[PDB]
Design a protein around this ligand. Structure first.
Ligand SMILES: *[C@@H]1O[C@H](CO)[C@@H](O)[C@H](O)[C@H]1NC(C)=O
Lengths: 48, 48
């Protein structure tokens, strides 16, 4: 009984939601009004 | 009672059937240890 094979994939399926906006993460990180550790700020990035 | 004992002797009879299954075999299980432990993954086959 030889070692098990698996059928090779004949194609690739790639799916992503199209036309989503850019997240602009650099614009928020480069904002010059920087908070201290006491009042550390959060931003949430989704659908981008 | 004197020399004699009381015994129940059959006066009529029938034949009865009884089934008995005896196991003599079992499912021949076989394992590919490599396919079970690692599936398709080359990084696992290397470590295995
Ligand atoms: C023996 O038993 C069977 C079933 O009960 C019956 O048909 C038959 O007549 C009986 N015979 C005697 C001699 O008792």
């Amino acid at each position: 009984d030889l070692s098990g094979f698996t059928v090779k994939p004949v194609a690739t399926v790639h799916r992503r939601i199209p036309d989503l906006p850019d997240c602009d993460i650099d614009k928020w990180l480069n904002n010059f009004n920087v908070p201290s550790p006491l009042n550390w700020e959060r931003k949430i990035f989704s659908n981008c | 009672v004197g020399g004699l004992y009381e015994i129940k002797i059959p006066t009529n009879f029938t034949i009865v059937g009884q089934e008995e299954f005896i196991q003599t075999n079992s499912p021949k299980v076989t394992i590919d240890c490599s396919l079970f432990v690692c599936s398709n993954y080359a990084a696992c086959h290397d470590l295995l």
